[PDB]
């Protein structure tokens, strides 16, 4: 998945949730939107 | 399979009008008994009444060349009793039959009304997929054949007229011309006509690929001579070279391939066209430099002192000397001098000098854009 | 908020045993079904297991709703049981059940023979469906995931192990 | 959203009137289709949006106050999303039969299915 300094978001079905030291981007509708870092 | 062919007009079994289906196994290999009965049953239900004691006729399955037995053809005879002495006319091919030869049993004298038999001893190679008819006399079947040669000359003049009026030009309309030529001989004459069409199918407009001199059978002296005369790749299917081709090949070793599978041939013509293809597209800056303080020199006329403002400057690359979106002067980077000495390369924030042969046109505050050009090599698909 | 602040029900003939901080419910099926507890206070009150924050902690409601969901699921586990059918999409795939192992052939040369814990049991209506029922939602869900692990869903053709509720998420083959 | 105390006042005087009369509706919706209600609507196109409207009015916690004492027989609401109608000629009028023949496909509960006098 993507790594970027900013989370930035994409769509309303992107949840935007922390795991440990690492934010993830979890999108039910779209794995293309997947990210970590933040 | 039964349901999916019940979505089409194939006459499906029971739900449709009944082309009968049989369920048997050929990939694994388990009989097939039922299928053999079904094939017989359809042929018994059909009316197959045929002359067994009269005259002979039929079609040519596949034709090829033998180098001890001559041009030959495998001919299925529809109408019974092709005899030992009969005169035959197939299209533009004629002759009295010398002998008849078969793979179920070697020596054939009088044939059935449903069997393929090889014929041998003919004038040229008879076309596959059309009609052989026995005839009254040999002399008359010269005269018909010479009329059919007149017909092939009518088809020759038709194919000669067509190419000029389709696009005005003899060949290529636009100035960016590229072509590939090939010289092709397949062993089977039905094959040579079919796969040559598929090699002219795949072409793009920019690089055009074309057949010159399609052959049947072994490579010969004159076949190698055509690709020596005008550059082309010389290929043959199961076809291979003979001694009089080898004599030309050992002198000038043209592109010579005797082959494996047709897909690799269709790939290698595409590869040849791709190598043929014109190669470059990308134009991208390396550096930008500002001019100040002109000097004069007998080497180049004027010398523009420069300071490179951005990017890298290299000895030979194209340049654009510009002020405010006009190109003031044009060139290729001629002289790169730093401080007092000509040097291979210079990077931004550095004093430079440059002058170009027949440059005397310096204006301070003009800008040089030096730019890199990068090849890409397009590939046909 | 709201459900972490709610007492959870005791349907009689459950064990409802508490001994230190373990909570051990056997009931209407199964055995054991034991959880161990931390900073969630809890009061048995006949028809409920009533919860609250324990002494000096900052995790009131946030530990408690965990315990709320746990002792709920233990009561549901001893009564109803958990999960559903694994279906086999992808032609030629086959499930063979035995009391120890769910064996699958998912295109692999070696047979998988996947072993099943005793608090769960499994079933074959068909050679393609595998149904299972059992004591605990955490353990049965992990077993379904271990089965799902062998051939994961793929959006090109959907081959491998589904649960029959996840998205197909179809992606077109781009020869175009 | 809505402040209940000021909002309910305007509604009840018009809404309550249908219940008081000779007959009142209790039409419902669940696993059917709205396109069939738009079928009953193109029937109500004939009467210009009055008699056969099958009005999916269904509020109870912002509206339909209990001040008249005979209106709560037909005004209960829940699952099976509720709809009203309009009645004037009365005495088992033949206007109903056009609504009636569509009941083959079901479209849940309808007027006088609850067995009241």
């Amino acid at each position: 998945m993507k790594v970027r300094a900013s989370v930035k978001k994409l769509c309303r079905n992107c949840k935007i949730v922390k795991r440990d030291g690492v934010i993830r981007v979890i999108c039910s509708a779209e794995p293309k939107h997947k990210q970590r870092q933040g | 399979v039964k349901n999916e062919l019940s979505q089409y007009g194939i006459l499906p079994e029971e739900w449709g009008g009944e082309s009968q289906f049989v369920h048997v196994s050929a990939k694994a290999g388990t009989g097939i008994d039922e299928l053999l009965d079904a094939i017989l049953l359809q042929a018994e239900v059909l009316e197959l009444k045929a002359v067994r004691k009269g005259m002979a006729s039929g079609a040519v399955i596949e034709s090829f060349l033998d180098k001890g037995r001559g041009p030959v053809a495998t001919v299925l005879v529809r109408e019974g009793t092709l005899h030992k002495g009969d005169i035959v006319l197939c299209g533009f091919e004629y002759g009295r039959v010398r002998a008849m030869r078969n793979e179920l049993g070697q020596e054939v004298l009088e044939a059935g009304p449903s069997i393929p038999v090889e014929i041998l001893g003919l004038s040229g190679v008879p076309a596959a997929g059309d009609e052989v008819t026995v005839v009254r006399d040999e002399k008359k079947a010269r005269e018909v054949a010479l009329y059919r040669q007149g017909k092939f000359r009518e088809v020759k003049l038709a194919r000669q007229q067509k190419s000029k009026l389709e696009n005005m030009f003899a060949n290529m309309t636009e100035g960016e011309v590229h072509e590939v030529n090939i010289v092709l001989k397949a062993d089977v004459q039905g094959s040579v006509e079919a796969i040559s069409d598929s090699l002219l199918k795949l072409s793009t407009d920019e690089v055009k690929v074309k057949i010159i001199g399609s052959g049947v059978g072994g490579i010969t002296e004159t076949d190698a001579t055509l690709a020596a005369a005008s550059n082309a790749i010389l290929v043959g299917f199961n076809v291979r070279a003979d001694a009089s081709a080898r004599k030309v090949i050992e002198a000038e070793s043209l592109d010579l391939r005797y082959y494996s599978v047709i897909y690799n041939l269709i790939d290698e013509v595409k590869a040849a066209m791709s190598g043929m293809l014109s190669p470059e597209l990308k134009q991208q800056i390396i550096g930008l430099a500002e001019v100040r303080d002109v000097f004069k020199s007998p080497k180049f006329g004027a010398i523009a002192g420069c300071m490179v403002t951005e990017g890298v400057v290299k000895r030979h690359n194209p340049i654009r000397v510009l002020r405010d979106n006009v190109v003031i002067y044009e060139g290729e980077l001629e002289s790169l001098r730093r401080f007092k000495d000509d040097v291979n390369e210079v990077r931004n924030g550095m004093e430079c000098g440059i002058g170009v042969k027949n440059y005397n046109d310096v204006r301070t505050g003009d800008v040089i854009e030096v730019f890199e050009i990068i090849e890409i090599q397009r590939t046909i698909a | 908020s709201r459900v972490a602040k709610a007492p959870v029900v005791v349907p009689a003939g459950v064990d409802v045993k508490i001994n230190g901080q373990v909570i051990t419910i056997k009931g209407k099926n199964g055995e054991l079904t034991r959880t161990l507890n931390d900073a969630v206070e809890v009061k048995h009150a006949d028809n409920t297991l009533t919860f609250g924050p324990r002494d000096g902690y900052a995790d009131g409601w946030a530990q408690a709703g965990t315990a709320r969901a746990l002792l709920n699921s233990m009561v549901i586990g001893v009564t109803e049981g958990f999960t559903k059918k694994l279906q086999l999409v992808g032609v030629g795939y086959r499930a063979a059940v035995k009391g120890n192992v769910i064996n699958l052939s998912l295109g692999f040369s070696h047979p998988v023979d996947h072993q099943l814990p005793a608090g769960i049991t499994a079933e074959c209506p068909t050679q393609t469906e595998i149904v299972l029922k059992g004591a605990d939602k955490q353990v049965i869900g992990q077993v379904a995931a271990d089965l799902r692990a062998y051939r994961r869903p793929e959006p090109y053709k959907g081959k491998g192990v589904r649960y029959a509720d996840e998205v197909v998420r179809t992606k077109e083959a781009k020869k175009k | 959203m809505a402040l209940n105390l000021q909002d309910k006042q305007a509604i009840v005087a018009e809404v309550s009137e249908v219940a008081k009369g000779a007959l009142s509706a209790v039409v419902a919706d669940s696993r059917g289709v709205t396109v069939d209600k738009m079928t009953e609507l193109r029937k109500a196109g004939r009467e210009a949006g009055v008699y056969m409207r099958v009005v999916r009015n269904t509020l109870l916690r912002r509206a339909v106050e209990g001040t008249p004492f005979e209106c709560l027989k037909d005004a209960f609401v829940g699952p099976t999303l509720i709809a009203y109608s309009m009645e004037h000629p009365g005495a088992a009028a033949r206007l109903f039969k056009e609504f009636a023949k569509a009941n083959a496909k079901f479209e849940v509960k309808a007027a006088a299915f609850e067995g009241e006098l």
Partner: protein, 141 residues
């Protein structure tokens, strides 16, 4: 009937009739029924008028009296009876092809009020007006 799972659906007015290939594998799965043109569209004509767009729904079932998806001629009968092609404008357009009025065009297909949902009259005119902005018959304020 009670099944809408698989069918094929077309517009079949005048010489316009049929989206291009019903003789392909789209309709070649099906069994046969004659009735449904004569059952479904053909109900509503003499209660309304002539100059109506014509949709159709093709399917087959055991009782031979199956459930119509489209109940009716498509709404903009007021435009389509008056002008254009029988299915409609005969071309998509922003502008150019016509105009809509409030002095003489109201009453032309007044009978389609009986099987249009479009109810009392001032909203019934506006409901066909947006359809006519689709078709192209736009008029300045």
């Amino acid at each position: 009937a009670k099944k809408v799972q698989a069918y094929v659906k077309l517009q079949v007015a005048a010489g316009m009739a049929n989206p291009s290939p019903p003789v392909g594998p789209a309709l070649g799965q099906q069994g046969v029924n004659i009735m449904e043109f004569c059952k479904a569209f053909n109900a509503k004509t003499d209660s309304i008028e002539k100059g109506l767009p014509i949709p159709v729904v093709i399917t087959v079932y055991a009782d031979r009296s199956f459930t119509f998806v489209t109940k009716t001629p498509p709404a903009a009968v007021l435009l389509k009876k008056a002008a254009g092609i029988k299915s409609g404008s005969g071309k998509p357009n922003k502008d150019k092809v016509g105009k809509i009025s409030r002095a003489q065009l109201q009453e032309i297909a007044q009978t389609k009020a009986a099987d249009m949902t479009g109810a009392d009259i001032e909203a019934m005119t506006r409901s066909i007006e947006g359809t006519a902005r689709s078709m192209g018959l736009v008029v300045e304020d």
